Inorganic pyrophosphatase
Amino acid sequence: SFSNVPAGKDLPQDFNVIIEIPAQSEPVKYEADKALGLLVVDRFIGTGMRYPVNYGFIPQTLSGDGDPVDVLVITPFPLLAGSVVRARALGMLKMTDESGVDAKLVAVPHDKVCPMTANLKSIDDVPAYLKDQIKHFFEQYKALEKGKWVKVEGWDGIDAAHKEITDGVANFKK
Amino acid sequence: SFSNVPAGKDLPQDFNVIIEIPAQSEPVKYEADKALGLLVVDRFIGTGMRYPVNYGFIPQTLSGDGDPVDVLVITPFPLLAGSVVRARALGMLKMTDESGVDAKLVAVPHDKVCPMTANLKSIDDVPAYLKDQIKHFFEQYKALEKGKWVKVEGWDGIDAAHKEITDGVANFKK
Amino acid sequence: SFSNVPAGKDLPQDFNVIIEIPAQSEPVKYEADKALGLLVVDRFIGTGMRYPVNYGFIPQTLSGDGDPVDVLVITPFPLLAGSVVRARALGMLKMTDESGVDAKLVAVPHDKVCPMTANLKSIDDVPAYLKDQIKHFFEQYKALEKGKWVKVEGWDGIDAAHKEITDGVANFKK
Amino acid sequence: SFSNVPAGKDLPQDFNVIIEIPAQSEPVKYEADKALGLLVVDRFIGTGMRYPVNYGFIPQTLSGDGDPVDVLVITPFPLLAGSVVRARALGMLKMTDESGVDAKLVAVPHDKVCPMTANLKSIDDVPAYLKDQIKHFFEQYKALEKGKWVKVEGWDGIDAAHKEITDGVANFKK
Amino acid sequence: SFSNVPAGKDLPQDFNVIIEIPAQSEPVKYEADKALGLLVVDRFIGTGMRYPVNYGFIPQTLSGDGDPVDVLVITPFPLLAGSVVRARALGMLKMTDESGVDAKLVAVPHDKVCPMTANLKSIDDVPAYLKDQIKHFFEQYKALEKGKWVKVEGWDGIDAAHKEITDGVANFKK
Amino acid sequence: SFSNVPAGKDLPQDFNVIIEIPAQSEPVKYEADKALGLLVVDRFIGTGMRYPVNYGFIPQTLSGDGDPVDVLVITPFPLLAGSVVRARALGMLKMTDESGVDAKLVAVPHDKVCPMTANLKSIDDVPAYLKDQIKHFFEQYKALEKGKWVKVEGWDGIDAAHKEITDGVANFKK
Ligand SMILES: [K+]
Ligand SMILES: [K+]
Ligand SMILES: [K+]
Ligand SMILES: [K+]
Ligand SMILES: [K+]
Ligand SMILES: [K+]
Ligand code: NA
Ligand code: NA
Ligand code: NA
Ligand code: NA
Ligand code: NA
Ligand code: NA
Ligand code: NA
Ligand code: NA
Ligand code: NA
Ligand code: NA
Ligand code: NA
Ligand code: NA
């Protein structure tokens, strides 16, 4: 299943995201097992906080931590966990957590998939209130797990997102 | 996954439907990718309109357009996207859209799966209000996508549904 | 999919459960098809009654009836149907139904997956009201299906749960 | 609020129902307080069972037990708790419980409010599966409360419903 | 209840809206009864179509048709039916229906109530896709009721909204 | 409506709570207007955080800030906004915010209303994970509103809750 989905139709700018956690879903952290082809319950989020936007990963990528490249996808209605969405990048949130460096991309679907998000061209177009909510979420969601923490370094734009994607694709192929 | 599900236990009258879109779900059009084994987001429906009944397809069939045979399944509670339901036919809605001829079957589950729908023997037993809603849905849901349109030709009964199924099974095997 | 998930990381006490029916979901009985890798609609529950806790099975086990070992998993929020949860046993409900002996385990997730349930050490820690609801559910949910019935024999503890799991693993390997 | 709503525009056949419990709502029994004008939590249902159809009462009536006349209203989507619906009668369920005789009417909205239910002319038109679910609900929902019980005597038709309504209106005026 | 809520703290620009229909709620048209103080079920929408944004009215106003001034309020999450929201105007949709002229205002909450909508200053700031959905909704939702119809004339801005509000307040006082 | 509900049947230990915000509801802060008898939208919570338990107030009380006494009510399913629940106290959370001292009670329903919570006798019986979530919620929910802040001082028990209630009742009567 998950293992055979292409990273994208035209990398890095035209990529695929497998959804693990729908926006506003009850506070349960699922992670795709690429060796089982199934979503696995990683943990019940200690704080009870919910992802403000959809969360998933790009298949066939391997990030700095040995996990696939992480992606937040903004949509007008939550997406189904375990579904695939063709997406494009807006930018990224840079952070470090208990396991070291942690960048997450911020994306929207392809314009023909989601006309509603077509006018979001870069991270600067995302409403400030949403940006602020995403940043608060990552700063606070691990507050009640011993040994876990997050510091947000800052936002970066589309070119940085594309580097992260090209690196991830390369690293995965070895 | 999807590719290996049989078209049915006793074709054409006793067939399987893989669900893509639960009745009344938020207005997001998923399509099964039979080569990925996963549901893929085709588009956010432009009008925000919702399927009035469950929508899916018969696996191992190939309709006139090169897609599997499409099915609307009526149930007392929505079905899970990506699940399989053993079904029987009531009839069909005949239409033409921007890509040519487009028939969709109307079905209910097998009587032992859904005793609640056992008294629906043919399309004529479906409440007129539901029939009318389904027809309005197909007439209007594509209203806000350029280049897309639908004209409803009319309803047909169980024998026409069975032909569509037998043709689809034959065509798929080449 | 389902067929390749291990029964557990350290049997019998540390096992995996694939979820078929989320706690409080609409009254539709799904069963995993291990040969299709998909959830299948077994039936619309005749009484309209809902599982009071999550329901699923241990993969790679084979119980007395030729089905995998059944498990009720208690969580603070319902789990996703078709997901996998690492679990530990609390005890079991002993019953006989129309097809003979029927034991179901009662479990919670691993403590690092669900800290919220860490203080449930055995079946005796489960609130009496929940115990009573589970027992009423099994006594009544089949009331409206001809030829189906259930008598509850009683509760048993962790050691009995572990026997059921070890037997199931052994039986599956032939 | 509740106290000033008329029992109906043309009694007994054209009456009003104030909704206390939406069909399929979580298992919490609300009762309108006509002296507070507010819904009050009577109890968490011990069995966790849910009303299969909407439940409420006719204002300005006084039944045999000193409570207003009780009504089950069938609709295609649940109604809002605390809302008012213009309705007509289909029949009634006769029962006795721990507090003596207990009849409940079965109704649908006025035809111009709910065209979808226009073809239900009497209790005999209600699907058998729904009838059976309603009867099971009342037989079982109090199973886990000490001192509470219900025996179902049987169904009766529109004329009996109308008597119950005329009596209730008369009794309320003293 | 409803009858005593002020039309606004500083008319016409700072006004109150009582919500009758939450955005995306199941397709049931409630109307506030100002003489009962309660929401009343007007009808089950024939097409099954849902309001794309919250819908309600300004209390203590009387529009051209003898009903209070109608308002669509855009929010990031649906509002509770029967609740009150302090709002400001963006513009209006002009229409005529079976009962003659029908203008509906488009509004957002006060900036301190909803910071998320602060950057919407006029109707021109509303995304085109949302504008298009609202217009499609009114063009189509009455399609299945005999004797009912709607033609959309066009959009107008904040000053026209304010006139409609001042007229409504004046007309209500006689 | 709200203004005429008694503070309780036997104060301070047997009191009434009017619910403003159901546990886990979308992140919108409603406040009862006792002069309108209606729920009013105070604000969209800036952080998007949700109340982990039901939130409301005791009618006919007047706390140190000039608002009624605030109460968190723990239940197995969320309660309806605007409903009334007979409750008993477990303890209280002591805090100071931007407007000075701020104590909130923690309660459960009367034992006959909610048998499921009967074994919670005091604040010390509440699971630590829930206690921790409630405290995190109040520490963080106002993070994104300028001029607003909260420091948690600590927990206190049933006797302190009862003082707060007796003071509130006295203060309200002048
Ligand atoms: K490229
Ligand atoms: K055949
Ligand atoms: K072991
Ligand atoms: K009459
Ligand atoms: K003014
Ligand atoms: K006392
Ligand atoms: Na990362
Ligand atoms: Na991380
Ligand atoms: Na087709
Ligand atoms: Na088509
Ligand atoms: Na079993
Ligand atoms: Na069984
Ligand atoms: Na009665
Ligand atoms: Na009764
Ligand atoms: Na109007
Ligand atoms: Na109109
Ligand atoms: Na306070
Ligand atoms: Na405060």
Q: What stands out?
A: Chain F touches chain A at residues 24, 26, 46-50, 52, 129, 132-133, 136-137, 140, 143-144 (CB under 8 Å). The CA atoms of residues 112 and 154 of chain F lie 30 Å apart. The two ends of chain F are 21 Å apart (CA to CA). Residues 1-174 of chain F form a domain with the Inorganic Pyrophosphatase fold (CATH 3.90.80.10).
